Structure formats: C-alpha cells, structure tokens
Design a binder for this molecule. Structure first.
Ligand SMILES: CCCCCCCC/C=C\CCCCCCCC(=O)O
Ligand SMILES: CCCCCCCC/C=C\CCCCCCCC(=O)O
Ligand SMILES: CCCCCCCCCCCCCCCCCCCC
Ligand SMILES: CCCCCCCCCCCCCCCCCCCC
Ligand SMILES: CCCCCCCCCCCCCCCCCCCC
Ligand SMILES: CCCCCCCCCCCCCCCCCCCC
Ligand SMILES: CCCCCCCCCCCCCCCCCCCC
Ligand SMILES: CCCCCCCCCCCCCCCCCCCC
Ligand SMILES: CCCCCCCCCCCCCCCCCCCC
Ligand SMILES: CCCCCCCCCCCCCCCCCCCC
Ligand SMILES: CCCCCCCCCCCCCCCCCCCC
Ligand SMILES: CCCCCCCCCCCCCCCCCCCC
Length: 272
C-alpha cells in the first residue's frame, strides 16, 4: 500500500517543507490542548464534554502527524551525488496511516457538535452511534480506495485504478449520511438558544462540511499525477484540512459552547 509520495525524489526544500508541516501541526495540536483545558473550566457542565472531546482530538492529531513526521524521516535517505532525498527500499510512507486516527477524530468532531446542539442521554447516544457507524464505514471504505492511488497516478506496474472510484464514491455516500445527521442536529438545537446561538451552530455545521470536504480533495490529488512539487501542494492541503477541521473548528465550537453557557446563566462563561 505505497502512496504516490513513495515513488518520488525530493530536493532539500521540498523534503524540509513537508517535514516542517508535520512538526508544526504536531506542535499546534499540543498547544491547542492548553486552550481546551482552560476553556473547559469556564464552560457550563452540560457543554464541558465538547471541550474535553477537543482535547482527545488534539492528542489523536498530535500522534497522527507525529507518526507522519517519523515515517517521512525514516522512508527517505539523502543521496549526496543526487542532492535529493530518495525513497528507501522496504520503508514505505503512506498518507493512508492518517486514516487509523480518523476513527477517533471523525466520530468525536461530529459528536461534539451534537453536544453543543444540546442533545443529552439517549438522543445524544443515538446520534453518536449513527455518526460512529457512518464515520467508521466512511474511513474504512476510503482506506480501501486510497490503497490503489498509485494506479490512479499512472505509477508504472500498478493496477486497480477502478477501486479508487468504486470505494471513493462509497465513502462519499457515508460522508453525506454524516452531514445529514449533523444538518438535522444544528436545525433542531435543544433548550431555548438565542437566534445568535442558532446562527452560530449552523456556521459550525458548514465550517465542518467545508473543512471535511478538503479530505476527499487530498484523496483525489493522485488524479493530477503529481511531481515532488504536487506532493508538497498535497501535504499543504492536508495541513490546512487538519488544523482547520480539528483545532480551528474546536476553538469556534468552544466559543459557541461558552455563549450557550453564558445564556443559561453560567457566570464563569459570562465573565469570559
Ligand atoms: C473489502 C475489501 C475488498 C477489496 C478488494 C479489492 C480488489 C481489487 C483488485 C484489483 O483491481 O487489483
Ligand atoms: C466530495 C465532497 C462531497 C460534499 C458533499 C456536500 C453535500 C452535502 C449534503 C448534505 C447537506 C445538507 C444541508 C442541509 C442544511 C443544513 C442546515 O442549515 O442546517
Ligand atoms: C473572545 C474570544 C475569542 C476566541 C479566542 C481564541 C483563542 C484560541 C487560541 C488557540 C490556541 C492554539 C495554539 C495555536
Ligand atoms: C485554568 C486551567 C489550568 C490550566 C491547564 C493547562 C494545562 C495543559 C493541558 C493539560 C494536558 C496535559 C496532558 C499531557 C498529555 C499529552 C499527550 C502527549 C502526546 C504526544
Ligand atoms: C483562554 C485563552 C488561552 C490562550 C492561550 C492558550 C495556550 C497557548 C499555547 C501555550 C503553550
Ligand atoms: C517509525 C514509525 C513509527 C510509527 C509509530 C507511531 C508513533 C507516533 C509517535 C508520535 C510522537 C509524538
Ligand atoms: C465492518 C465493520 C464496521 C462496522 C461499523 C462500526 C461499528 C461502530 C458502532 C458503534 C455503535
Ligand atoms: C472495508 C470494507 C467496508 C465495507 C462497507 C460497506 C458495507 C457495510 C455494511 C454491510 C451490510
Ligand atoms: C433525501 C436526501 C437524498 C440525499 C442522498 C445523497 C446521495 C449521496 C451521494 C454520494 C455519492 C456522490
Ligand atoms: C470557508 C470556511 C473555512 C474553510 C477552510 C479553509 C482554510 C483556509 C483558509 C485560508 C487561510 C490561509 C491558509 C493558507
Ligand atoms: C500552510 C499552513 C496552514 C495552517 C492552517 C491554516 C488555518 C486556516 C484557518 C481558516 C479558518 C479561520 C477562521 C474562520 C472564521 C471564524 C470566525 C467565527 C465565525 C464568524
Ligand atoms: C475565533 C476563531 C479562532 C481562530 C483559531 C486559530 C487558532 C489556530 C490557528 C493556527 C494556525
């Protein structure tokens, strides 16, 4: 299961930029941990779970991008005569590795939105269950599709390009199911939210839809049969997706949770 990244040589700048993307992302998610810990204390008990879920996603994402940093360093070797980083035999890098921790990220990011919508008990657990089923199936089917991206990129000797489309389209169907669950949640918030909260919950849904939509775009980059430069672009695309979907979304959602907390008379949330 080699990703397109494995079949290319990288000049120092290309290799070093991608290395810094993984490292910077890891650092930013760890820093996010501090923000969510602090915000949790100023959030009403009934919405505090959302800040706690953001912390879980920060740790998941730090290990995700940390593994990519390690695999990137291990999978390529400096060739002095070429003045490039070249693929090491037996050591394979794949974006595919990031799919494992999506099994945490995807259901949790979706569920925390449902929490701030004000769903509790069975109503929350029914939605969490459906988002987890849809999310796991989305990721597992997507994983099968990306397995064949070399054939899609026209890497000599590689077949099964049709699998990329078959499983890609299956995954997209599961994505749409998650979006419809979440659309229903933000349209039907619990309690008596202000018009401002109603509007901000809808903003959070569309922000999730926008940032999540970057992942199928990154999945599709092998269609563009990229050079080392195209791979730099792809890993920048993933970095924008990761930081925006996990940390920026988390911060925006935490601020809606603070507003709901304040509206419901939680003093520490009003003071903040
Ligand atoms: C579930 C997973 C089954 C995936 C099977 C994919 C077979 C592809 C064969 C090929 O085209 O090379
Ligand atoms: C490949 C990328 C696929 C992107 C799919 C986007 C289409 C999403 C469909 C479901 C969205 C339904 C939105 C209903 C209104 C939401 C609201 O305002 O509450
Ligand atoms: C009125 C408050 C506005 C929102 C505050 C935003 C602060 C978020 C800081 C995130 C830190 C992550 C590290 C980078
Ligand atoms: C106002 C509240 C007090 C401030 C709390 C800020 C503390 C920082 C956040 C706590 C997280 C620490 C847990 C460490 C585990 C990190 C996992 C490492 C993954 C590589
Ligand atoms: C309540 C606002 C807190 C903002 C600072 C969060 C911590 C930033 C990273 C420091 C390490
Ligand atoms: C060599 C590849 C090791 C992959 C295992 C994942 C470990 C993640 C560690 C991240 C550190 C933060
Ligand atoms: C095939 C395996 C995938 C099954 C869906 C994931 C199960 C999670 C359900 C949690 C409730
Ligand atoms: C990795 C394979 C995942 C298959 C998902 C499609 C079927 C799931 C439900 C079966 C009934
Ligand atoms: C009633 C609403 C119908 C929406 C169905 C969405 C279709 C999913 C398409 C996925 C593949 C592209
Ligand atoms: C439009 C809603 C947010 C979608 C995510 C887009 C993230 C990138 C926005 C530009 C910021 C500079 C990144 C380079
Ligand atoms: C190449 C490095 C990329 C770093 C990640 C870039 C992060 C992009 C942030 C996009 C979203 C910005 C905030 C959106 C506006 C939210 C304001 C509150 C609601 C109006
Ligand atoms: C009001 C929204 C706050 C924006 C969050 C940005 C913090 C992470 C950006 C790192 C790049």
């Amino acid at each position: 299961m080699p990703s397109i990244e494995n079949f290319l040589a990288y000049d120092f700048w290309q290799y070093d930029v991608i290395r810094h993307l993984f490292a910077f992302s890891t650092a930013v998610f760890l820093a996010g941990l501090v923000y969510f810990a602090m915000t949790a204390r100023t959030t009403a008990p009934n919405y505090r779970l959302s800040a706690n879920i953001s912390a879980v996603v920060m740790v998941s994402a730090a290990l995700e991008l940390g593994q990519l940093w390690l695999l990137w360093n291990e999978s390529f070797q400096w060739a002095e005569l070429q003045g490039s980083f070249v693929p090491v035999a037996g050591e394979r890098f794949s974006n595919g590795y990031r799919y494992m921790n999506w099994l945490i990220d995807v259901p949790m990011l979706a569920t925390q939105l449902v929490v701030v919508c004000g769903f509790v008990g069975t109503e929350l657990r029914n939605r969490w269950a459906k988002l987890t089923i849809a999310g796991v199936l989305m990721i597992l089917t997507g994983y099968v599709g990306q397995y064949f991206e070399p054939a899609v990129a026209g890497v000599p000797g590689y077949e099964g390009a049709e699998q990329f489309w078959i499983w890609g389209i299956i995954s997209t169907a599961f994505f749409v199911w998650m979006l419809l669950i979440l659309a229903n949640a933000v349209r039907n918030p619990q309690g008596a939210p202000s018009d401002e909260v109603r509007s901000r919950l809808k903003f959070c849904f569309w922000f999730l839809l926008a940032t999540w939509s970057i992942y199928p775009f990154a999945y599709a980059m092998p269609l563009f049969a990229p050079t080392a430069d195209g791979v730099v672009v792809r890993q920048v695309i993933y970095t924008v997706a990761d930081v925006s979907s996990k940390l920026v979304f988390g911060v925006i959602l935490s601020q809606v949770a603070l507003r709901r907390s304040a509206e419901e008379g939680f003093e520490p949330a009003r003071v903040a």
